[PDB]
Design a protein around this ligand. Structure first.
Ligand SMILES: [Mg+2]
Lengths: 72, 248, 49, 209, 218, 223
């Protein structure tokens, strides 16, 4: 990835984008839980941004999954 | 020699001081890389015992900003010399004329970017034939004080150091002249007597009995600063009066 | 005087010569200057920076 | 204790010698993209050192940490590969000396060159205001993953085409690029290839070459 | 030892669509990227055997700057369109075809007569366009075999001959890596052809031509 | 449609160092292509025999100075780096020089060896001024390409001297019209090389041709 304009409108704020992407990247770095999109030698953080742009990752989704496993 | 001067380079170089200007005319009896002897012309000879100048040129020595002050002889053997001429070129001098930089065949043209704001290409030739290359001469000074708990020792014996470091040192603890040191090598083997009074009054008891450590010395050797190569030229030793001079 | 001095050598009076581009081997249009500018090397050395 | 320069109120304001820092003289960097900063080898093996340790011991090339240290200090060929991997995407922050603007702490991706000079894309020499006549820029790095994402999202050199004060771009072709463009498009009344109809642009480039 | 030089390992053959290819080679020694790139560029653009339309004539016109009734386009427009035609021909050096037709609608390359050996690679390529049924297009087109670009001035209307099938060739050199030495030049040639032959075989032909040229030395 | 292959029609030795070769026949466009390719390849990828290490007897380290010789040690190494030698067969080889007495120390008095041959004996190495002063030295020589300084390739009397492995120093190619030959447009390509004498024109041009042919044959087959 080079620019992050596509991710701005997906999470409108450009800072909540940063923290949400950091949440997903931390999940994908040591919290296992491989990315849902293929990687191209990309770091975990860029994969998080990529999936955010793909729309399949958002703060709501992360919270839903965290709550679901916290019920376990 | 600058290819476009102003006629002031000659006087600046002559009168600056570092050009080893002659004193009496005559003939150059014996040139050398470190000395020029000038047979005086008969007329200028003193009433007695002339025929001697012995211009001691200055072989390599450090300047005040790490630039070698090297004087080379610019007279062929037997060539006559007149009073007040230039026997030996100084640093950045060429037959007397001041020569600060060097020529370089330039072509004002914007090449593919690499001279964008003010940058300057340079063909490998300028570095290949090695016409820009200085002789910076550093001066690392290592000292041996006498703090509390005994003096500092400059012995080659150092704990927690491999045989590689001690390979090039001398027995005293000082590197040999002409040792192609590199980053991290010990120039001087220096050590300190393991801190100070620590632990508990049992430690004072130990001091009364004296410790039981063969090493009993911390490593404080002065190494090459990280990131600089170099070939040691000279290693001077200075002694406080009342200290017997060691092997080095 | 510079024009005459150059003319003493065979070099062109303009002070400019055509330069070929080494990488491709074509000609630079717009002929270019070439001379001997006595350049220094100030002691702001990168490996001290 | 609550007064003077050593007063612990005005203490984090005076200035902190931050770690993972750097410096160098600057050099033009054509062939770089607009989000790449040519970083030296000899300085990129002393900035991402702990990252190299991590990716090295993890890969098992030298499990024990002291072995990893002695490997990197040994310049073994594998450490170059590992360093390339870690700096694959790990934005660095290039900061000029007087940081008046808020662009003066822009952040780039690294690409490794040889020698020792922090290359720098030409177009982004305006916001910095550097002039490549001895100007020196410092390289910081973001450690924590949040800081990495910030350096890639909020500060990356490709997300600051418009400067804060004036809306219009501050990535504006400056000195030689405009002379090249100017030369590349000028009406000459009569020259070679005058009076003809070639094709779309492709045959035009073919004609010129 | 001195004879040794890092040979490339052909890696990238990315063939975007059917004619635009982006080949890359690496790692080459310092500067070989530029010399190979320029040699290939010059040989490809300047000297490449091929066949292209050279001369065209209209039955009812003898002047270049005129027009035919019922034609939405103009004579020079048809000249440009024909210049863009991609055609490969059998070993016959040159041959003349005709575009006799009449009707309403676009007139493409497919409307051209097959004439045995000659085969147009892009029949769907557009040439002209008629609007009136009474309007009849008739014209002769001669195609020769050549090894370069022939402007009209360098020479019964004349069409600049683009014999070389390669249409564009741009080479860059970008620094690759091999262990420590990091000034090795990865070459990157993107070339696009008219369609009479894929870029791969074009590069093969250019390389073979250069190699045969150098053969006499060794 | 045919492509006239070139041939090395002549190799005239205008001077000892620099010389000119002529290539013929060549067709339009091929002239400048081959000329530039050959200039570029020749100016870099060639084998040489430049000195690499020097070991003077009474010299401890480079920045010192001996006696009886006006030249400082650094000037001696500079001149040796400028020395040109023609070495065949053996990869690397050691030479000796123990000239004694006043006068020049030109390369001629270097100790004789086998296939090693000093191309330019006149090239001064150093000078002697004191009668009972002798300069005894061992000079190593290997063969390589391009440029390899001391540091990259890195006792105490082992003075390392930067390599300068290259036989050529100025390559210029011109393209001109040839005889009628019943066919115009045939280009004569005259390539002049200014070499230090270690390498003859024919050998250099053929090696350049070979290296380029190999590099391009790496292009003949593609995936
Ligand atoms: Mg400035």
């Amino acid at each position: 990835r080079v620019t992050v304009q596509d991710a701005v409108e997906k999470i409108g704020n450009r800072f909540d984008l940063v923290l949400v992407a950091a949440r997903r990247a931390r999940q994908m770095q040591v919290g296992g839980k491989d990315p849902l999109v293929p990687e191209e030698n990309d770091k975990t953080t860029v994969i998080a941004l990529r999936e955010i742009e793909e729309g399949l990752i958002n703060n709501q989704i992360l919270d839903v999954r965290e709550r679901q496993e916290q019920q376990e | 020699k600058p290819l476009v001067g102003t006629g002031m380079e000659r006087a600046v170089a002559v009168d600056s001081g570092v050009t080893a200007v002659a004193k009496r005319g005559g003939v150059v009896q014996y040139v050398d890389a470190s000395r020029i002897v000038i047979k005086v012309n008969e007329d200028e000879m003193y009433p007695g015992e002339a025929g001697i100048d012995i211009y001691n040129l200055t072989k390599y020595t450090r300047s005040n900003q790490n630039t070698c002050i090297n004087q080379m002889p610019c007279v062929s053997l037997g060539e006559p010399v007149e009073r007040g001429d230039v026997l030996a070129d100084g640093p950045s001098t060429d037959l007397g004329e001041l020569a600060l930089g060097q020529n370089m065949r330039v072509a004002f043209m914007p090449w593919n970017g690499y001279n964008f704001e003010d940058s300057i290409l340079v063909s490998e030739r300028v570095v290949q034939e090695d016409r820009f290359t200085t002789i910076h001469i550093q001066e690392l000074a290592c000292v041996s004080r006498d703090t509390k708990l005994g003096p500092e020792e400059i012995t080659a014996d150092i704990p927690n150091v491999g045989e590689a470091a001690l390979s090039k040192l001398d027995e005293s603890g000082i590197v040999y002249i002409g040792a192609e040191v590199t980053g991290g090598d010990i120039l001087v083997g220096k050590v300190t007597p393991k801190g100070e009074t620590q632990l508990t009054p049992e430690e004072k008891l130990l001091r009364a009995i004296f410790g039981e450590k063969a090493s009993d010395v911390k490593d404080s050797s002065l190494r090459v600063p990280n990131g600089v190569s170099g070939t040691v030229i000279d290693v001077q030793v200075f002694t406080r009066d009342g200290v017997e001079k060691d092997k080095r | 005087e510079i024009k005459e001095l150059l003319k003493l050598g065979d070099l062109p009076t303009s002070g400019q010569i055509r330069l070929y581009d080494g990488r491709t081997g074509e000609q630079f249009e717009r002929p270019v200057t070439v001379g001997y500018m006595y350049m220094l090397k100030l002691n702001h050395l990168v490996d001290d920076k | 204790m609550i007064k003077g320069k050593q007063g612990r109120f005005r203490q984090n304001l005076l200035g902190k010698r931050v770690d993972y820092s750097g410096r160098s003289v600057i050099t033009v960097g054509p062939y770089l993209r607009l989000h790449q900063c040519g970083l030296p080898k000899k300085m990129a093996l002393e900035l991402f050192k702990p990252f190299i340790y991590g990716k090295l011991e993890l890969r098992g090339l030298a499990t024990t940490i002291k072995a990893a240290k002695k490997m990197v200090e040994r310049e073994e060929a594998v450490v170059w590969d590992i360093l390339d991997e870690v700096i694959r995407e790990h934005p660095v922050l290039l900061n000029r000396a007087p940081t008046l603007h808020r662009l003066g702490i822009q952040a780039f991706e690294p690409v490794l060159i040889e020698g020792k000079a922090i290359q720098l894309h030409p177009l982004v020499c305006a916001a910095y205001n550097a002039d490549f006549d001895g100007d020196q820029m410092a390289v910081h790095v973001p450690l924590t993953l949040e800081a990495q994402l910030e350096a890639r999202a909020l500060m990356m050199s490709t997300n600051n085409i418009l400067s804060p004060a004036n809306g219009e771009p501050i990535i504006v072709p400056s000195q030689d690029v405009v002379l090249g463009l100017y030369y590349m498009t000028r009406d000459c009344v009569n020259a070679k290839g005058e009076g003809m109809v070639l094709t779309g642009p492709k045959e035009a480039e073919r004609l010129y070459r | 030892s001195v004879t040794e030089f890092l040979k490339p390992r052909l890696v990238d053959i990315e063939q975007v669509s059917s004619t635009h290819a982006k080949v890359t080679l690496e790692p080459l020694e310092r500067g070989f990227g530029h010399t190979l790139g320029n040699a290939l560029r010059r040989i490809l653009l300047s000297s490449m055997p091929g066949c292209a339309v050279t001369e065209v004539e209209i039955d009812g016109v003898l002047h270049e700057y005129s027009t035919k009734e019922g034609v939405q386009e103009d004579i020079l427009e048809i000249l440009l369109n024909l210049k863009g035609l991609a055609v490969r021909v059998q070993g016959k050096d040159e041959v003349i075809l005709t575009l006799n037709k009449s009707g309403i609608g676009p007139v493409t390359a497919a409307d051209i007569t097959h004439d045995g050996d000659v085969e147009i690679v892009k029949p769907q390529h557009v040439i002209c366009h008629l609007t009136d049924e009474n309007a009849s297009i008739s014209m002769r087109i001669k195609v020769q075999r050549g090894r370069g670009y022939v402007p009209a001035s360098t020479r019964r209307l004349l069409v600049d001959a683009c014999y070389s099938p390669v249409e564009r060739i741009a080479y860059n050199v970008e620094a690759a890596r091999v262990e420590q030495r990091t000034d090795l030049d990865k070459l990157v040639i993107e070339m696009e052809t008219n369609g009479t032959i894929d870029p791969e075989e074009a590069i093969r032909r250019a390389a073979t031509i250069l190699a045969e040229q150098l053969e006499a030395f060794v």
